[PDB]
Ligand binder design. Sequence first.
Ligand SMILES: Cc1ncc(C[n+]2c([C@](O)(CO)[C@@H](O)[C@H](O)COP(=O)(O)O)sc(CCOP(=O)(O)OP(=O)(O)O)c2C)c(N)n1
Ligand SMILES: Cc1ncc(C[n+]2c([C@](O)(CO)[C@@H](O)[C@H](O)COP(=O)(O)O)sc(CCOP(=O)(O)OP(=O)(O)O)c2C)c(N)n1
Ligand SMILES: [Ca+2]
Ligand SMILES: [Ca+2]
Lengths: 667, 662
Amino acid sequence: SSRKELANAIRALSMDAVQKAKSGHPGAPMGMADIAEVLWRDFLKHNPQNPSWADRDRFVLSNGHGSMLIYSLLHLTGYDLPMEELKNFRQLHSKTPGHPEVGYTAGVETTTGPLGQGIANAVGMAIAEKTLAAQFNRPGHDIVDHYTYAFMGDGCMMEGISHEVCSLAGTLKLGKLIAFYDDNGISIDGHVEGWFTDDTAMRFEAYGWHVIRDIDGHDAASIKRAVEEARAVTDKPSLLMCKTIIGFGSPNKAGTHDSHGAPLGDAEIALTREQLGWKYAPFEIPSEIYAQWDAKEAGQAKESAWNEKFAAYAKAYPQEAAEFTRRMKGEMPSDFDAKAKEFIAKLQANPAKIASRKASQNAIEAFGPLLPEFLGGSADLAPSNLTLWSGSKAINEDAAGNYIHYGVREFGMTAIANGISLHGGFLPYTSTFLMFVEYARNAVRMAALMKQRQVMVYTHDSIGLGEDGPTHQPVEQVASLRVTPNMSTWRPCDQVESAVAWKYGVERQDGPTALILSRQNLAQQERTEEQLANIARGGYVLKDCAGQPELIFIATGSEVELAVAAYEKLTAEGVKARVVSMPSTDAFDKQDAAYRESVLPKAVTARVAVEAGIADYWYKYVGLNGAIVGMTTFGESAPAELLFEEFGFTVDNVVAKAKELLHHHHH
Amino acid sequence: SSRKELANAIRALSMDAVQKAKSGHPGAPMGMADIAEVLWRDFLKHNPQNPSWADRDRFVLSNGHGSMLIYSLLHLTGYDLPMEELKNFRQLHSKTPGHPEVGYTAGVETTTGPLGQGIANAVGMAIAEKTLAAQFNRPGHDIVDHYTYAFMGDGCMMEGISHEVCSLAGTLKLGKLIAFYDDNGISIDGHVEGWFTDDTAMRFEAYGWHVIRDIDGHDAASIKRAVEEARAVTDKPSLLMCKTIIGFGSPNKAGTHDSHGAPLGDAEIALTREQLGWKYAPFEIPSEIYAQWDAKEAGQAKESAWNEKFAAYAKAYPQEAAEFTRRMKGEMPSDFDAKAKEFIAKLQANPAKIASRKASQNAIEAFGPLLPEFLGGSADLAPSNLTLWSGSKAINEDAAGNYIHYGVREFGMTAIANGISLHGGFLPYTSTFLMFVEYARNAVRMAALMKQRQVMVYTHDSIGLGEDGPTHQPVEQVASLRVTPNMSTWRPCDQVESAVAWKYGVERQDGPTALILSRQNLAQQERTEEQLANIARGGYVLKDCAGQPELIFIATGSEVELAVAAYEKLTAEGVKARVVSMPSTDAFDKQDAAYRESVLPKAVTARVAVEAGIADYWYKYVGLNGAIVGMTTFGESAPAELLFEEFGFTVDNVVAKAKELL
Ligand SMILES: Cc1ncc(C[n+]2c([C@](O)(CO)[C@@H](O)[C@H](O)COP(=O)(O)O)sc(CCOP(=O)(O)OP(=O)(O)O)c2C)c(N)n1
Ligand SMILES: Cc1ncc(C[n+]2c([C@](O)(CO)[C@@H](O)[C@H](O)COP(=O)(O)O)sc(CCOP(=O)(O)OP(=O)(O)O)c2C)c(N)n1
Ligand SMILES: [Ca+2]
Ligand SMILES: [Ca+2]
């Protein structure tokens, strides 16, 4: 078959699958089919029979609405994605969801759909390869050596996140990153000139990319020459400007916004078959075409060669090889649990009243020698977030390092870290002030959706930060994280809860963990062995009374100290009170019914929540017959101690609100 | 005095105020003082006696941590910002908060601090000036003619939002936008070359900006020449690459990250006074320096000249002049309330089962002829969000238009719209799929913080959107909006609630309004006159029983129909059931307690919330002894009908959960 005929197989499967689903996006798959045929058949290093091969090239579809493009490629090249699944495109529980999802489907590297985040993930995968190669490669043993290829469109280019990640990719001279721009002149509103007029080549040159202009995206020879040129440039990431026609093949819809996002229709599909010379019925592919598309034999051979290379590496570097295998699997060091518990116990036995941002740094310092897989960073706030430990080494200084200066790029940072976690070999941590999680919000959600391990270090968590004022002072951000499916959120009250939360985060294999950390010093609380162990259960009894409590305080983070003081005052006056520390609502909710009842007994309705965050959240635990000492407004610019006074975070006010509540209950 | 001495007054006030507060950022004010002296003294058209003058130039400090720069400028030029306020920098309830805040302080145009958003706001202000000029100017009567000036640093440049808004500014040929880049080579982590290496000038030329390279930011002559050149280029926004030294004047801290964000210290301040040759004590400014800085006389002359121009315009164009005054004040047409109510009443009398995204478009169509101040748009989703009406005219085609194609730029769109609202003259609406509010989240927050009127049209609100799947299907986004201070959030259940929500949004004078709208068709509910009037109260009794209810359903948006169906089944069994429609929790919460008690009586604890969004929100209204039929997970890719079934949005499940409570 000709290269065009082979590319047309993608066009047919894509338009036909969209038609059967009566839903989906045929335009981009039809526009990019020739580029995909060249990349996948001539260049991509992969094994369909082992999608987890450590040294495979990584491909990312950033314009993820063109999902049938990747499903066609995976099916045709011999991945475990049967034709029946393509016939079930966009149907419940199929392996072919409307936008591609990692874990759902053999060979899908990341979940896309939100424009711009795919290219960010690809930048992270390229950083991971570069860093892992520098750490593990040895003379005569280059066990890490693979490319990262990304497809992206106008939407990804317009999004601000593309600026963040492609700027940083230039700085880091990511020579194994090669991106293909689907330059088709069309977006949803129509011809892009009305809203998008960048000289995109000049923009990427400004970032230090190697740009290849004016590629005929429908000419295999032109595409191939461009890819070869990009592969020859080892010191810059490359952008291939591929001029394509959206919906290529459709006489009446090619080059129009109509082809972007809806079924072509049966009449137009018939006309498209005629234009393309594609004779086969929907979901029919002849054996001859499979023979040319299949990658099982080449894939086997390439992986077998790599396995032999790895075996030789293991002979010469046994400890390094064991570390490589452990880290690629995401497994923890065998002695980590014991060593982390020893650290936690030491902290409980040796009180220190320090900011939880500092307690976080101390945990990084303690874990750093144990977790060489750390690849950590901050969005230009290293001296504020406290993300550097004594063994930190920035990768812009030494490629074998373990730290990334992300610059003022919160969204880019977080989506890059998603790419790092997806790659394998590393445990990423990222950091900014909690407020600026709002800049990165959808990337945080994507880590949770993709079930990725990433520790998110969010400092300066409340009005406790003081003078910087209401644009910086979080109020409603923690509640936003708490209600995010599969997110874990910890607001530790002292250095001990901080270390427990850090341990929980690094050991959490199936989702991310956000640490909500203070600028200001936090009092250490006293704990029995049982209470110490109970921190990890998310919510636990910290102070108690004999018999049923009349009153339960529920507090988090910096406000536990305040709740304990109120508990002491009320106790001295003969009130039967309890304090529950709730460092993680999500972990508490995951405990069984009996444990939750032991902490928040259903009989006790006089419940007082205390937290310098939005009050409305706390109805979940206090119900309609309690009280909340929280925030209901934005903050103010002033010294923190005056803000806590102003907003009612005082012993006198907490005691007054508790007594007021009890008075209401009694009458 | 020399220009350097005049600029040094800013340096002294800034380092001294930071020192007294033991908090703040002296570096950028000291680095930018010479640029500020040239811009403010030689070019800026403003009146300190009236910071609200309609035709003033707008200045924006995008690198807002350098707040003492703007406070120094406002004080020195004669705004109502006394020295005592500068001595109360960063102190409770002062007019000098740590980052500048619009409303707090005479002359502050916007609230900055979140990097990148200032330049976005400035792009919005320049769009507003260009559009207002095209709408209102007439031959011989150019009543709108002013510049938008912005200062910005490396942080703003690194942020993605700068790419979004500066790209669009190039497309729109904003020739009266002039930005100054504080090119000082330093950020918090240290020397920027480790993380920021863009050829920024080349980048901005790629956007179609006019770029002036290699300006000596400490030389008045160099700066002045560059501003003149930028003002001569009328068809492109301009970027001035100003090479500066952060903390300029400090022998030991200039050019270091140390000067960025902390007091210099007493010893270093003494050395700085020596290096600068500044002989005045903290908070001492001599009369000669005030005399050269003060702008009261020139400002009043310029505004008076403009007032005379406006009076002549009003004689020639009385209807247009009245519209200008109304729109600049943000006032609504006197008959808008009556006309909108007439539209709402018509919808209730003429039922239609349509998507609330379509009901939204219909409200835009109804209101369009009444609100010429609309400046609306969508982030590349016009045919999906349904933001065009018959009178929409895109400003890239017709400068006097009322519609913006924002491109795939949610964050930039929203912060641009903040600039549009801050400018005066317009009522902006913006739009994208609800999920992608997450891309714009901090700009949404900033609209609320700044008390700005903007209608945010968020369609495709739930699993009801169907096949696009969990990356697109909102679950927890509405809950996040609901707990945002000063945000109004409406999730209408039909075309009637949709029009009421739109009316509420445009009539807000002090904050934004998010509309939570469906992809799929929603059934219209029957309403009495009292129920119809009570939609605007945010929560109301839609279906009832005789006497005290035994069971109350609380539902929103697309789930009201489901709750009504459950109510009908239980009513037939003889349960005293009620359905409450809760289109807006914030509007409900603001009602008097007697009204709230009439809808959700305190004695009735058997409450079932029904909404295709995160369950945890609803404890606010159901407490610990109710039930919630909600989402607790991400969505899935499948047809909407099958998703609603899969996730428990069925009559059987709603009835079963209700029967558990009873
Ligand atoms: C961050 C972000 N913003 C907007 C979108 C929306 N959007 C996207 C989608 O959501 C697909 O992913 C929509 O096509 C929805 O499926 C439409 O839903 P219905 O109207 O059928 O209900 S795609 C997109 C335009 C992308 O333009 P491109 O130039 O990137 O792509 P192409 O040349 O058209 O291949 C835009 C603007 C997104 N996916 N991500
Ligand atoms: C969207 C966003 N991200 C990060 C920041 C943090 N940030 C900022 C601030 O927040 C000031 O606004 C911090 O200086 C905090 O005051 C520090 O708090 P503490 O450590 O004293 O507790 S400024 C900034 C770096 C800006 O670099 P630039 O090059 O823009 O500014 P300059 O040359 O240093 O004038 C960076 C990175 C921000 N303001 N906005
Ligand atoms: Ca396109
Ligand atoms: Ca700087």
